[PDB]
Design a binder for this molecule. Structure first.
Ligand SMILES: CC(C)(C)OC(=O)N[C@@H](CS[C@@H](Cc1cccc2ccccc12)C(=O)NCc1cccnc1)Cc1cccc2ccccc12
Ligand SMILES: CC(C)(C)OC(=O)N[C@@H](CS[C@@H](Cc1cccc2ccccc12)C(=O)NCc1cccnc1)Cc1cccc2ccccc12
Ligand code: HEM
Ligand code: HEM
Lengths: 436, 436
């Protein structure tokens, strides 16, 4: 624990680290509470230790823009390593430096405006499965688990948009990794993975069994026809990454939104009127009608403020720099506390209140893009942003065109956040559903 | 690799060990071929190294009886450790010394003659599910996968006999452990288990959800009313052990038997006649009618000779001894090569031929019980022997009372054994089924 002297030397403040553990015992309220409390206790900049790993928090918009954008390629190219990963080191969200630049370049036209447009008339089928599955679980007095039917929809979107598989989807130790990150090399030589070898072996062969537009796999197969050419396993590993995000992020966010709509009935009505004015007669939403719904966008934007599911953004400082008058020595992890900045009263009036009008064009400009960052920023931001927003908005239009949402006896009010690792709710979201 | 001098010193012969790996590269033909070849090359006694771990093979019946029986409690009490195990160190097949003696004593009356008898009229229901599931997959030209419908039956026997759950069941790195057994302590502090924490968490709570004769769980719950008293988690971990054996061993053996019957049509007819003489009119088999069928027993006995699914028996020598005129120093693993002894021509004429008459009472006596040992011997033998035999025999009577079994184009003839770890076949067993 010789490394625990770094921040005292640099004159950067923070909580005093315990030997070996660093500051990790403070994760007992979750990343988010620790960050918020640190943000209060110390200010625009502070430091702590994940084990022996020094981590510097920054909250200055300029500094954040310097890290996330200005010096991305040169200094702050990669994220904190987190093995053992195996054959998935070749996945874009994990790869680094030159190998990452290769994959970012190769996989970016997958997510264009125009390819997303080709995906709309296809994403459109499973909202109608989603509604008919909601019909059954609503025609009778029986509260619904959103993450069940949102996940089943998110999955149906994934299998389709990623492989063409059109299915009706009714058919804990990481802590030791920070105290023992020296044990990651060890688990790598033991073939131990954070997956099982079965889910991936399922797909390693499944990919070659189809077989053989517009799913991500074809899009990537087409790109194998500046840099080199995507290889076969490299493509399987990207599939797995895409499947993670589009299933768990999409449906989890969709649950925070139905919760907010159900606990704020005015905002639900105001939005149901908009959907009916743009799409009268319950007209099927399209790419452009979706981008036309402003209140819908404000709802989505404000929900991501309260529940930024990344919570933090992170870049490893790959060599001594002096960003914005501050020396940052190589190997430090630079961290942006999204959740805490999103709930910072120095930028957001009533920051725990769910107030979509913050994102009205009347007020959307008093909002610093390096304070509100649910999808990252600069060259390593969420490659899947536009798809994610489109994917979700398509769900809400078709669901709010048919149903209204009420709190139950079991509805957790107020929603506790996962005190643990990922930004989920404690009890699952359950509401009453009713048909218009 | 200072430990690799042990067998040269003791003047005990064997294959020369490579540094660090020991003799493990020889597992490329599988345990069995290495043992058979060692048995030939060197004789009644030889030695090798799993990494730095010295292992002594013995094939003398007296010596085997000394290890397995005479000096079991005193010297040869436990098996080779094989973590990481977690909360399952408390499972009988894994526990050692005093803790094992406690569990062997507490769990033995579960498997009496009389408790097995109470299980017959209950095991009897799922042979009739097995037959009706075989009916559908046979009424039309379509070969059957035995391990599918034998496993589904073995499972239905398990869930019932172990928890009362009556369900119709149509509803790779270990190598590093021997070169790196020093890494087992490491994986233990990382909570890494050979299970997932989900299968067991499934059961840790499931056990307490029922709720609350004659299943194993009740039998064990009753025994919590010389030694101490079985605890709550100790009981969950025994459930998991029982479920392993009774599912995978039972159905795998049942596949070697249907294979032998289908590839030896006389023995299939001779057995079908016996079942019909003891149980005319397809009378439902009972505990006693099953113990009456001698040819059936001979079939089972001979199949376990060709496919002893343990392959080896193993005991750790817990202190210097001199069994049968031979010094054995503490820490050596003593190993009995079942598979190789079962296929040794010095005891078995035509040992690769499937000849049940070796177990006719006319000849069953020319058979040394420390050469043929499919269930172990002495105080640590298979606690589940009588249940296993009963369980399987019940399946064959009801299945051979209705169906006959023929080889297909895809039937692997001759059966290759799993060249890898466990004693399974290479391609799965598939046969034609037909209704009498
Ligand atoms: C243990 C800890 C929480 C510290 O680490 C993670 O367990 N897993 C993060 C890193 S990778 C991935 C998800 C994933 C989970 C479990 C095992 C994996 C094994 C190999 C590769 C990826 C695996 C992923 O990126 N899926 C796309 C995504 C997810 C969320 C939002 N958008 C896109 C997950 C993570 C969370 C928040 C922001 C992230 C930004 C870039 C990369 C990962 C990010
Ligand atoms: C890797 C290697 C092949 C060397 O080790 C094993 O992977 N697993 C043997 C040891 S324990 C168990 C099966 C089991 C598998 C995987 C993970 C486990 C984790 C915790 C506890 C048990 C686990 C078991 O005993 N189930 C009852 C049984 C099985 C077979 C015949 N009768 C009874 C399996 C084994 C094989 C042959 C004979 C055995 C005798 C005593 C104990 C175990 C024996
Ligand atoms: C509500 C949904 C989502 C949210 C809120 C979200 C947010 C984020 C954030 C904050 C990051 C890190 C940005 C940074 O480090 O600067 C990220 C990265 C990433 N996301 Fe998303 N994401 C979502 C959905 C998706 C989807 C649907 C995909 C589909 C492919 C996806 C693919 C990725 C990838 C590939 C990366 C890493 C980019 C790179 O390393 O080059 N995400 N996401
Ligand atoms: C065809 C089926 C089976 C065969 C061939 C078989 C064989 C064996 C063998 C060879 C051993 C090691 C014996 C020794 O070390 O001396 C063993 C141990 C064991 N078996 Fe079985 N077995 C079978 C089924 C079962 C079943 C159904 C159970 C159900 C509970 C079971 C429970 C156990 C236990 C608990 C042990 C360890 C005994 C102890 O350590 O005290 N086995 N088996």
């Amino acid at each position: 624990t010789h490394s625990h002297g770094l921040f005292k030397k640099l004159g950067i403040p923070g909580p005093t680290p315990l030997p070996f553990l660093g500051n990790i015992l403070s994760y007992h309220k979750g990343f988010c509470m620790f960050d918020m409390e640190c943000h209060k206790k110390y200010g625009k900049v502070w430091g702590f230790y994940d084990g022996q790993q020094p981590v510097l928090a920054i909250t200055d918009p300029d500094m954040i823009k310097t890290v996330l954008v200005k010096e991305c390629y040169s200094v702050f190219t990669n994220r904190r390593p987190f093995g053992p990963v195996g054959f998935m080191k070749s996945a874009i969200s994990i790869a680094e430096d030159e190998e990452w630049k290769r994959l970012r370049s190769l996989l970016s036209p997958t997510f264009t405006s125009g390819k997303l447009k080709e995906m709309v008339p296809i994403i459109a089928q499973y909202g109608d499965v989603l509604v008919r599955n909601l019909r059954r679980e609503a025609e009778t007095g029986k509260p619904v688990t959103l993450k069940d039917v949102f996940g089943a929809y998110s999955m149906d979107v994934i299998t389709s948009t990623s492989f063409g598989v059109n299915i009706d989807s009714l058919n804990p130790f990481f802590l030791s990794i920070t105290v023992f990150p020296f044990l990651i090399p060890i688990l790598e030589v033991l073939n131990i993975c954070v997956f099982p070898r079965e889910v991936t072996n399922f797909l390693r062969k499944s990919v070659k069994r189809m077989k053989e537009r517009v799913d991500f796999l074809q899009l990537m197969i087409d790109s194998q026809n500046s840099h080199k050419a995507l290889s076969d396993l490299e493509l399987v590993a990207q599939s797995i990454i895409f499947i993670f995000a589009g299933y768990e992020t999409t449906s989890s966010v969709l649950s925070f939104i139905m919760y907010e709509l159900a606990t704020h009935p005015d905002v639900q009505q105001k939005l149901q009127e908009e959907i009916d004015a743009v799409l009268p007669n319950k007209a099927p939403p399209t790419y452009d009608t979706v981008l036309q719904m402003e209140y819908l966008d404000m709802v989505v934007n404000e929900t991501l403020r309260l529940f930024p599911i990344a919570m933090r953004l992170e870049r490893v400082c790959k060599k001594d720099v002096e960003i914005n008058g501050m020396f940052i020595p190589k190997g430090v992890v630079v961290m942006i506390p999204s959740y805490a900045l999103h709930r910072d009263p120095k930028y957001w009036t009533e920051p725990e209140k769910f107030l979509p009008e913050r994102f009205s064009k009347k007020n959307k400009d008093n909002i610093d893009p390096y304070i509100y960052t649910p999808f990252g920023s600069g060259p390593r931001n969420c490659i899947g942003m536009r798809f994610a927003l489109m994917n979700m908005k398509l769900a809400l239009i078709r669901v709010l065109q048919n149903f209204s949402f009420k709190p139950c006896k079991e509805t957790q009010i107020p929603l506790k956040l996962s005190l643990g690792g990922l930004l989920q709710p404690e009890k699952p979201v359950v509401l009453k559903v009713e048909s218009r």
